[model samples]
Target chain A: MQIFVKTLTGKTITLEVEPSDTIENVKAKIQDKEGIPPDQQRLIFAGKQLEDGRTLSDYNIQKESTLHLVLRLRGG
Target chain B: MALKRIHKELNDLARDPPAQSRAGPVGDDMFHWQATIMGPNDSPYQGGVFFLTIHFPTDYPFKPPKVAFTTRIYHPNINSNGSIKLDILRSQWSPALTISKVLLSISSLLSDPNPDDPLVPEIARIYKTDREKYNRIAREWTQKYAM
Candidate 1:
């Protein structure tokens, strides 16, 4: 299957990835494209953070699916 | 927009730091965020640390975030009861803004407030003409609560 990934806070590029891809792989792709650090990356689908080690298969993600990569800013 | 970017910016800033305050103690809700800000220099709000809450819609970036002060402070733009009126955080918000950028704006607002759009007219008036008195009160407030 395929996954469509996008981000709200960085370079605007939506790409297709495989169902076997993990959140860490998504981070690598985002880092490669956006110059953003991997540590700052978060994968959110359905309003929840996608923890590392999780795969699209685990979540039953399919082609044409949209996943958002948002930049979280810390405030006091 | 990717949720990773939000988390990334939040995490990076957590380690790197910024001009004023810090973010976090965040609730599980992705749409809700809380942050604290330190009072500005030589102002009535100086030394005061104020808490602010940010609420984002499901379609953010395409939409703007909502922000309000949770901490009580007296100021022209902030009511005695602690309500803040800022356009960029409200109707004027644009998707180009990030949380870091927004917080920076709040930090700047502390130093050079927009008294024209007064949330508290009396406070605005005093802040306009009697800068010293305003600073004094602000400093006192900071010492009392912010310090």
Candidate 2:
């Protein structure tokens, strides 16, 4: 199925994945497409936080789903 | 021009997301949404998560999205029924505005209510004549419903 994500930078990154794929896997795919580190990424869909260990199916993310990605800023 | 407009707004949200608010289409329903807003730190509603429901018209952008709180809130501008007395939601709404912007404005309404022109005039009176009492009740409601 197809899923779309919008990043804090306002770019839309579309990816293909299975429903059972873990949220961590999704983050990895995002990392592969964009330079944003998986650790710095936070995924929010429908006002709920997606757990890294949970699968997209766990959140009921179906085809053509859109999610918001937030980035954590670290201060050295 | 329907879902496409909302999709544009969704992308715009990611591009310049507000710190204390979030929103997206619920499930596969692109026109219906559920939004979450964190109470402003300086206000009594602080530390609570408020949920809202939004429904966009088939001719949205030209028509304002119907938005209202799902979680109970206490304020002069908003009533027990969750209907808000906001000019922007009604007469002052603009096509240029999006749900993200509306949610931000709603948070601002939480921080500083428009007591002068109120929805619940009784609460409006309470807010004006006895502010401390108003905050106490507002804080109590936030704890009960929003937390």
Candidate 3:
């Protein structure tokens, strides 16, 4: 399956992903492509945060799905 | 990592500084910077030119930079002693963030102050209760100190 990732700045990129891939895997790809730290990336899909522990299949991510990526807004 | 990143940010800023804000090193100290932000046009602070001091941490990019106003202004997020309380500078920092982004955020704050989370409770109360009065005093302080 392929996922469409939309950045906070509204730039969108398409990635080839597998159903078995975890959110962390997707984060790694995003980190490499965008240079945003995986820890700082907050991915929202279908109005919910995509947890790192969950797989693409777990969240029912389908082909052509769009995920919004935003940096964590608050400090630790 | 710190020095290289700072140099990159400096170059980026020189290439394209954000609207209403400009920042660069102060003298020969790369870690110490002087920044200037113009008050937002629609805000009471309009026509004011505010100065800020920026000190980057030795482990910057991983650590957020410390920023404080050098020019006084009446705002809920800014204390009387010239300190500003912004969460992004303290906690929500990412290595990807640059001085340009930080200055832009501060400029945005001038237009929309967070009254609920304020550095000055009195000013926050006035801002929440009597906005007209708040604007008046803010304008007064901008003229008195920022000019």
Candidate 4:
């Protein structure tokens, strides 16, 4: 599936990915691009983060879908 | 570091324009430029392309450009008429940054957004806690003013 993603640093990324991948997997990819550690990465979906135990499928996301991601820097 | 990075990005962008912005306004000979920013997808600003004017001083590398929204937007960072309230554009800028780089930063401001130094306090409060509503108003402004 193909999707368009954006980073907090204002960089845009478009890529093709597997349909079976989890939302966490997508977040990991975005984190990788932004050079942020996985644990510190926070992905906001529809203005809310996907809490643990919630999957992309649970959020009504399907194959070949697109998602927008923003990276946050809280403090200096 | 910020100036050097901005210069490097300016050089790269001069060679290859980003999808988000172009070179500048068509008729200006001086440092004046106009930039178009595609509204963030999935936001209230979606489908609205905002335009801006960047006016650079003679001592450009030392002072930052004056950026104002020509498209007339309503947001926390932007006034009712689209004047940007960011410090870097006004008095907090560092030397070494380029015009195109500043445009890119302004584009990002349209997307992710920042309410640190808000021109519209009410909008800022709404944007901080009630994004959907704030987005709705912003979208209305974009639709009414920007194309």
Pick the DockQ winner: 4
lDDT of 3 at A15: 87
Could you report the Cα RMSD, in angstroms, for every candidate shown?
A: 16.3, 14.0, 9.5, 7.5
Which digits, one per residue and each the tens of the lDDT, describe model 3 over residues B1-147?
Answer: 888888889989988978568888998898999989998887999999999999999999889999999898999989978787666687667776678877866765677676767889999899999999999999999899989
lDDT of candidate 4 at residue A36, scale 0 to 100: 63
DockQ ranking from best candidate downward: 4, 3, 1, 2
Looking at model 1, give its docking quality level.
incorrect
After TM-score superposition, the amount by which residue B52's alpha carbon in candidate 2 deviates from its true location, in angstroms, is: 0.2
Ten consecutive residues with minimal summed lDDT in candidate 4 chain B?
A: B1-10
Q: Who wins the lDDT comparison?
A: 3
User: For model 4, which pairs clash?
Assistant: none
- Which residues of candidate 2, in runs, are more than 4 Å off? A1-76
Error of 4 at B107 (Å): 2.0
Candidate 2 CA-lDDT value: 0.81
Taking the true A–B contacts (Cα pairs closer than 8 Å), what share appears in each candidate? 0.00, 0.00, 0.00, 0.00
lDDT of 1 by residue, A1-76 (tens): 5466665434346656887988888788777877767665556676455777988778777787887664432220
Query: Which candidate model has the greater DockQ, 1 or 4?
Result: 4
Quote the lDDT for B60 in model 1.
78
Q: Which pairs of residues collide in model 3?
A: A74-B92, A75-B91, A75-B92
lDDT of 4: 0.63
Q: Which regions of candidate 1 are displaced past 4 Å?
A: A1-76
> Candidate 1: interface RMSD in Å?
11.5
Question: Model 2: per-residue lDDT, tens digit, B18-110?
Answer: 757888899899999988889888699988998889999999998889999888998988877787665557765678667876775676568
Taking all chains together, the TM-score of candidate 1 against the true structure is 0.59
